[PDB]
Design a binder for this molecule. Structure first.
Ligand SMILES: [Mg+2]
Ligand code: NA
Length: 317
DNA sequence: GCCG
DNA sequence: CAGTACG
DNA sequence: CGGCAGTACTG
Protein backbone atom coordinates (compact mmCIF):
# COMPACT_ATOMS: atom_id res chain seq x y z
CA UNK A 1 0.00 0.00 0.00
CA UNK A 2 1.42 3.34 -1.18
CA UNK A 3 -1.36 5.58 0.11
CA UNK A 4 -1.68 5.02 3.87
CA UNK A 5 -1.81 8.76 4.58
CA UNK A 6 -4.97 8.63 2.48
CA UNK A 7 -6.58 5.28 3.33
CA UNK A 8 -6.34 5.69 7.10
CA UNK A 9 -8.23 8.98 6.76
CA UNK A 10 -10.93 7.37 4.59
CA UNK A 11 -11.07 4.41 6.95
CA UNK A 12 -12.19 6.59 9.84
CA UNK A 13 -14.87 7.91 7.50
CA UNK A 14 -15.86 4.38 6.45
CA UNK A 15 -16.42 3.29 10.05
CA UNK A 16 -18.29 6.48 10.92
CA UNK A 17 -20.83 6.00 8.12
CA UNK A 18 -21.10 2.31 9.00
CA UNK A 19 -21.89 2.89 12.66
CA UNK A 20 -24.35 5.70 11.81
CA UNK A 21 -26.25 3.20 9.65
CA UNK A 22 -25.37 4.62 6.23
CA UNK A 23 -24.41 1.14 5.07
CA UNK A 24 -24.34 1.71 1.30
CA UNK A 25 -22.07 4.69 1.64
CA UNK A 26 -19.83 2.63 3.96
CA UNK A 27 -19.80 -0.11 1.33
CA UNK A 28 -18.71 2.42 -1.26
CA UNK A 29 -15.83 3.61 0.91
CA UNK A 30 -14.74 0.05 1.67
CA UNK A 31 -14.29 -0.67 -2.03
CA UNK A 32 -12.31 2.51 -2.63
CA UNK A 33 -10.21 1.90 0.46
CA UNK A 34 -9.29 -1.55 -0.92
CA UNK A 35 -8.56 -0.14 -4.38
CA UNK A 36 -6.04 2.24 -2.82
CA UNK A 37 -4.55 -0.74 -0.97
CA UNK A 38 -7.21 13.17 -10.05
CA UNK A 39 -7.25 11.65 -13.53
CA UNK A 40 -5.43 8.63 -12.13
CA UNK A 41 -7.83 8.44 -9.16
CA UNK A 42 -10.87 7.98 -11.39
CA UNK A 43 -8.91 5.43 -13.45
CA UNK A 44 -9.13 2.76 -10.74
CA UNK A 45 -12.35 0.73 -10.35
CA UNK A 46 -14.24 1.44 -7.12
CA UNK A 47 -13.09 5.08 -7.24
CA UNK A 48 -15.55 7.64 -8.64
CA UNK A 49 -15.15 11.40 -9.04
CA UNK A 50 -16.35 12.13 -5.51
CA UNK A 51 -13.85 9.69 -3.99
CA UNK A 52 -11.12 11.03 -6.31
CA UNK A 53 -11.78 14.57 -5.07
CA UNK A 54 -11.34 13.52 -1.43
CA UNK A 55 -7.97 11.95 -2.29
CA UNK A 56 -6.84 15.15 -4.01
CA UNK A 57 -7.90 17.15 -0.96
CA UNK A 58 -5.69 14.84 1.12
CA UNK A 59 -2.86 14.91 -1.43
CA UNK A 60 -3.07 18.67 -1.92
CA UNK A 61 -4.23 19.86 1.52
CA UNK A 62 -3.29 17.11 3.98
CA UNK A 63 -6.45 17.27 6.06
CA UNK A 64 -9.88 15.98 5.01
CA UNK A 65 -12.69 18.38 5.87
CA UNK A 66 -15.48 15.82 6.09
CA UNK A 67 -13.19 14.14 8.59
CA UNK A 68 -13.00 17.43 10.51
CA UNK A 69 -16.77 17.58 10.96
CA UNK A 70 -17.57 13.96 11.82
CA UNK A 71 -20.13 13.90 14.65
CA UNK A 72 -18.51 13.66 18.07
CA UNK A 73 -21.10 10.94 18.81
CA UNK A 74 -19.24 8.53 16.56
CA UNK A 75 -16.54 7.23 18.93
CA UNK A 76 -19.24 6.42 21.50
CA UNK A 77 -21.43 4.75 18.91
CA UNK A 78 -18.45 2.60 17.88
CA UNK A 79 -17.75 1.76 21.54
CA UNK A 80 -21.37 0.66 21.92
CA UNK A 81 -21.54 -1.12 18.54
CA UNK A 82 -18.57 -3.34 19.45
CA UNK A 83 -20.81 -5.03 21.99
CA UNK A 84 -21.76 -8.34 20.39
CA UNK A 85 -25.49 -8.27 19.67
CA UNK A 86 -25.65 -4.48 19.50
CA UNK A 87 -25.62 -2.69 16.16
CA UNK A 88 -26.26 0.79 14.82
CA UNK A 89 -29.91 0.99 15.95
CA UNK A 90 -29.24 -0.03 19.56
CA UNK A 91 -26.10 2.12 19.76
CA UNK A 92 -27.99 5.22 18.56
CA UNK A 93 -30.81 4.54 20.99
CA UNK A 94 -28.44 4.22 23.93
CA UNK A 95 -26.72 7.42 22.84
CA UNK A 96 -30.06 9.22 22.51
CA UNK A 97 -30.87 8.08 26.07
CA UNK A 98 -27.75 9.84 27.38
CA UNK A 99 -25.43 6.84 27.77
CA UNK A 100 -21.76 7.55 26.92
CA UNK A 101 -19.71 4.76 28.51
CA UNK A 102 -19.82 1.00 29.00
CA UNK A 103 -20.30 1.78 32.68
CA UNK A 104 -23.53 3.56 31.73
CA UNK A 105 -24.62 0.59 29.60
CA UNK A 106 -23.83 -1.77 32.44
CA UNK A 107 -25.66 0.19 35.14
CA UNK A 108 -28.53 1.73 33.16
CA UNK A 109 -29.02 0.11 29.76
CA UNK A 110 -31.52 -2.61 29.08
CA UNK A 111 -29.68 -5.54 27.54
CA UNK A 112 -30.61 -8.69 25.69
CA UNK A 113 -29.10 -11.96 26.86
CA UNK A 114 -26.73 -11.81 23.88
CA UNK A 115 -25.67 -8.23 24.61
CA UNK A 116 -25.02 -8.96 28.28
CA UNK A 117 -22.67 -11.74 27.18
CA UNK A 118 -21.02 -9.46 24.63
CA UNK A 119 -20.44 -6.87 27.33
CA UNK A 120 -19.10 -9.47 29.78
CA UNK A 121 -16.46 -10.35 27.16
CA UNK A 122 -16.04 -6.90 25.61
CA UNK A 123 -12.22 -6.92 25.54
CA UNK A 124 -11.90 -10.61 24.66
CA UNK A 125 -14.13 -10.24 21.59
CA UNK A 126 -12.01 -7.33 20.33
CA UNK A 127 -8.90 -9.54 20.37
CA UNK A 128 -7.67 -11.94 17.73
CA UNK A 129 -6.11 -15.27 18.69
CA UNK A 130 -2.89 -16.70 17.24
CA UNK A 131 -3.94 -19.14 14.49
CA UNK A 132 -2.31 -21.86 16.62
CA UNK A 133 -4.97 -21.38 19.30
CA UNK A 134 -7.63 -21.71 16.60
CA UNK A 135 -6.03 -25.04 15.71
CA UNK A 136 -6.46 -26.23 19.32
CA UNK A 137 -10.08 -25.07 19.47
CA UNK A 138 -10.88 -26.90 16.23
CA UNK A 139 -9.18 -30.06 17.48
CA UNK A 140 -11.19 -29.84 20.69
CA UNK A 141 -14.46 -29.63 18.76
CA UNK A 142 -13.32 -32.30 16.29
CA UNK A 143 -12.33 -34.92 18.87
CA UNK A 144 -15.63 -34.43 20.69
CA UNK A 145 -17.40 -34.85 17.36
CA UNK A 146 -15.39 -37.85 16.21
CA UNK A 147 -15.83 -39.56 19.57
CA UNK A 148 -19.58 -39.54 18.96
CA UNK A 149 -18.99 -40.51 15.32
CA UNK A 150 -15.69 -41.26 13.59
CA UNK A 151 -15.16 -40.41 9.92
CA UNK A 152 -17.13 -37.21 10.54
CA UNK A 153 -15.53 -34.29 8.76
CA UNK A 154 -14.47 -31.27 10.79
CA UNK A 155 -12.70 -28.27 9.29
CA UNK A 156 -11.75 -24.77 10.36
CA UNK A 157 -12.87 -22.10 7.90
CA UNK A 158 -12.89 -18.28 8.00
CA UNK A 159 -9.63 -16.36 8.41
CA UNK A 160 -7.96 -19.55 9.65
CA UNK A 161 -8.44 -21.36 6.34
CA UNK A 162 -7.43 -18.25 4.39
CA UNK A 163 -4.06 -18.57 6.13
CA UNK A 164 -4.14 -15.54 8.43
CA UNK A 165 -1.68 -15.34 11.31
CA UNK A 166 -4.48 -14.37 13.69
CA UNK A 167 -8.21 -15.13 13.85
CA UNK A 168 -11.09 -13.16 15.35
CA UNK A 169 -12.85 -16.46 15.97
CA UNK A 170 -13.03 -20.14 15.02
CA UNK A 171 -15.43 -21.39 12.36
CA UNK A 172 -15.87 -25.18 12.43
CA UNK A 173 -17.71 -26.75 9.49
CA UNK A 174 -18.90 -30.30 10.14
CA UNK A 175 -20.16 -32.81 7.62
CA UNK A 176 -20.47 -36.57 6.95
CA UNK A 177 -19.56 -38.04 3.61
CA UNK A 178 -21.85 -40.98 4.35
CA UNK A 179 -25.21 -39.44 3.39
CA UNK A 180 -27.50 -38.41 6.28
CA UNK A 181 -25.47 -39.53 9.24
CA UNK A 182 -26.32 -36.77 11.69
CA UNK A 183 -29.51 -36.70 13.71
CA UNK A 184 -29.38 -34.47 16.77
CA UNK A 185 -25.59 -34.29 16.45
CA UNK A 186 -25.73 -30.79 17.92
CA UNK A 187 -27.49 -32.24 20.95
CA UNK A 188 -24.58 -34.56 21.63
CA UNK A 189 -21.62 -32.44 20.48
CA UNK A 190 -22.69 -29.44 22.58
CA UNK A 191 -23.52 -31.57 25.63
CA UNK A 192 -20.09 -33.14 25.16
CA UNK A 193 -18.33 -29.76 25.01
CA UNK A 194 -20.36 -28.51 27.97
CA UNK A 195 -19.38 -31.49 30.14
CA UNK A 196 -15.71 -30.74 29.41
CA UNK A 197 -16.53 -27.19 30.53
CA UNK A 198 -15.24 -25.97 27.14
CA UNK A 199 -18.27 -23.83 26.22
CA UNK A 200 -18.77 -20.81 28.49
CA UNK A 201 -21.74 -19.05 26.87
CA UNK A 202 -24.21 -19.47 24.03
CA UNK A 203 -25.08 -16.53 21.77
CA UNK A 204 -27.20 -18.26 19.17
CA UNK A 205 -28.35 -21.81 19.81
CA UNK A 206 -31.90 -22.85 18.95
CA UNK A 207 -31.76 -26.29 20.58
CA UNK A 208 -35.52 -26.69 21.08
CA UNK A 209 -35.99 -27.29 17.36
CA UNK A 210 -34.06 -30.13 15.79
CA UNK A 211 -32.86 -28.47 12.59
CA UNK A 212 -30.47 -26.09 14.38
CA UNK A 213 -28.06 -25.12 11.60
CA UNK A 214 -25.50 -23.07 13.50
CA UNK A 215 -24.06 -22.76 16.96
CA UNK A 216 -22.57 -19.42 17.93
CA UNK A 217 -21.06 -19.21 21.36
CA UNK A 218 -18.06 -18.75 23.54
CA UNK A 219 -15.36 -21.19 24.52
CA UNK A 220 -12.16 -21.21 26.53
CA UNK A 221 -9.33 -23.68 26.44
CA UNK A 222 -8.12 -25.20 29.72
CA UNK A 223 -5.24 -23.84 31.77
CA UNK A 224 -3.70 -20.49 32.76
CA UNK A 225 -3.36 -17.58 30.34
CA UNK A 226 -6.53 -18.32 28.35
CA UNK A 227 -9.10 -15.90 26.99
CA UNK A 228 -12.72 -16.38 26.01
CA UNK A 229 -12.95 -17.02 22.26
CA UNK A 230 -15.88 -16.98 19.87
CA UNK A 231 -16.79 -20.28 18.30
CA UNK A 232 -19.14 -20.86 15.39
CA UNK A 233 -20.12 -24.39 14.44
CA UNK A 234 -22.31 -25.41 11.53
CA UNK A 235 -23.48 -28.84 10.51
CA UNK A 236 -24.39 -29.34 6.85
CA UNK A 237 -25.50 -32.15 4.51
CA UNK A 238 -22.61 -33.57 2.50
CA UNK A 239 -24.12 -32.49 -0.82
CA UNK A 240 -23.85 -28.87 0.39
CA UNK A 241 -20.26 -29.24 1.64
CA UNK A 242 -18.42 -27.31 -1.11
CA UNK A 243 -20.84 -24.39 -0.96
CA UNK A 244 -20.75 -24.36 2.85
CA UNK A 245 -16.95 -24.51 2.74
CA UNK A 246 -16.89 -21.59 0.32
CA UNK A 247 -19.35 -19.51 2.36
CA UNK A 248 -17.71 -20.18 5.71
CA UNK A 249 -14.20 -19.51 4.35
CA UNK A 250 -15.03 -16.04 3.00
CA UNK A 251 -13.96 -13.34 2.96
CA UNK A 252 -17.33 -11.66 3.43
CA UNK A 253 -16.45 -9.33 0.55
CA UNK A 254 -15.25 -12.24 -1.57
CA UNK A 255 -18.56 -14.03 -0.98
CA UNK A 256 -20.66 -10.98 -1.83
CA UNK A 257 -18.62 -10.28 -4.96
CA UNK A 258 -19.05 -13.89 -6.06
CA UNK A 259 -22.75 -13.87 -5.18
CA UNK A 260 -23.24 -10.61 -7.06
CA UNK A 261 -21.49 -12.21 -10.03
CA UNK A 262 -23.78 -15.25 -10.00
CA UNK A 263 -26.80 -12.94 -9.91
CA UNK A 264 -25.52 -11.42 -13.18
CA UNK A 265 -25.78 -14.86 -14.85
CA UNK A 266 -29.31 -15.70 -13.71
CA UNK A 267 -27.69 -17.90 -11.06
CA UNK A 268 -27.63 -17.87 -7.26
CA UNK A 269 -25.08 -18.89 -4.65
CA UNK A 270 -25.61 -19.56 -0.96
CA UNK A 271 -24.17 -21.55 1.91
CA UNK A 272 -26.48 -24.29 0.71
CA UNK A 273 -25.90 -24.47 -2.99
CA UNK A 274 -25.29 -23.00 -6.32
CA UNK A 275 -28.52 -22.71 -8.34
CA UNK A 276 -29.17 -21.95 -12.03
CA UNK A 277 -32.13 -20.36 -13.84
CA UNK A 278 -33.23 -18.38 -10.80
CA UNK A 279 -36.12 -16.08 -11.72
CA UNK A 280 -35.81 -12.51 -10.37
CA UNK A 281 -37.75 -9.25 -10.91
CA UNK A 282 -36.61 -5.83 -12.12
CA UNK A 283 -35.47 -4.98 -8.57
CA UNK A 284 -33.17 -8.00 -8.39
CA UNK A 285 -35.52 -9.84 -6.02
CA UNK A 286 -36.11 -13.60 -6.33
CA UNK A 287 -39.57 -14.37 -7.76
CA UNK A 288 -39.03 -18.01 -8.73
CA UNK A 289 -36.57 -20.70 -7.74
CA UNK A 290 -34.07 -22.06 -10.19
CA UNK A 291 -32.37 -25.38 -9.96
CA UNK A 292 -29.56 -26.72 -7.80
CA UNK A 293 -26.34 -27.61 -9.60
CA UNK A 294 -23.95 -30.43 -8.62
CA UNK A 295 -20.94 -28.95 -6.84
CA UNK A 296 -18.86 -31.75 -5.25
CA UNK A 297 -15.90 -29.34 -4.83
CA UNK A 298 -15.15 -25.63 -4.52
CA UNK A 299 -13.56 -25.86 -7.96
CA UNK A 300 -16.93 -26.86 -9.39
CA UNK A 301 -18.55 -23.68 -8.06
CA UNK A 302 -15.83 -21.56 -9.65
CA UNK A 303 -16.00 -23.58 -12.88
CA UNK A 304 -19.79 -23.34 -13.12
CA UNK A 305 -19.49 -19.55 -12.73
CA UNK A 306 -16.83 -19.38 -15.44
CA UNK A 307 -14.19 -18.24 -12.97
CA UNK A 308 -10.61 -19.34 -12.44
CA UNK A 309 -10.22 -21.10 -9.10
CA UNK A 310 -8.89 -19.13 -6.14
CA UNK A 311 -7.03 -20.68 -3.21
CA UNK A 312 -8.42 -19.67 0.21
CA UNK A 313 -5.38 -17.43 0.71
CA UNK A 314 -6.31 -15.36 -2.36
CA UNK A 315 -9.88 -14.72 -1.15
CA UNK A 316 -9.27 -11.84 1.28
CA UNK A 317 -10.80 -9.73 -1.47
C1' DG B 1 -19.86 5.93 -1.42
C1' DC B 2 -19.68 3.26 -6.99
C1' DC B 3 -21.53 2.02 -11.42
C1' DG B 4 -24.66 -0.10 -15.10
C1' DC C 1 -41.62 -8.18 11.98
C1' DA C 2 -36.75 -5.19 13.06
C1' DG C 3 -32.35 -5.86 14.47
C1' DT C 4 -28.14 -8.28 14.32
C1' DA C 5 -25.29 -11.57 12.85
C1' DC C 6 -22.40 -15.17 9.82
C1' DG C 7 -18.91 -15.66 5.85
C1' DC D 1 -32.64 5.62 -11.13
C1' DG D 2 -31.60 2.22 -7.79
C1' DG D 3 -29.01 -2.24 -6.60
C1' DC D 4 -25.26 -2.83 -3.64
C1' DA D 5 -25.73 -11.26 -1.06
C1' DG D 6 -28.17 -14.56 0.92
C1' DT D 7 -28.80 -16.51 4.56
C1' DA D 8 -30.05 -17.93 10.31
C1' DC D 9 -31.73 -16.48 15.23
C1' DT D 10 -33.85 -13.52 18.96
C1' DG D 11 -37.91 -11.49 21.11
MG1 LIG E 1 -22.13 -5.36 17.81
NA1 NA F 1 -13.91 -16.36 11.46
Amino acid sequence: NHNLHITEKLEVLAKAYSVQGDKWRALGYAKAINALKYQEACSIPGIGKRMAEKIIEILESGHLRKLDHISESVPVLELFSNIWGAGTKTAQMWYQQGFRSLEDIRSQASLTTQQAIGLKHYSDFLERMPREEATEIEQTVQKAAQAFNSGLLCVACGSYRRGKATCGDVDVLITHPDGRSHRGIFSRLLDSLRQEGFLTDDLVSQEENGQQQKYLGVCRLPGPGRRHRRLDIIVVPYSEFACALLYFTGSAHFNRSMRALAKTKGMSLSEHALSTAVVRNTHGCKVGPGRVLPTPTEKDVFRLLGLPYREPAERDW
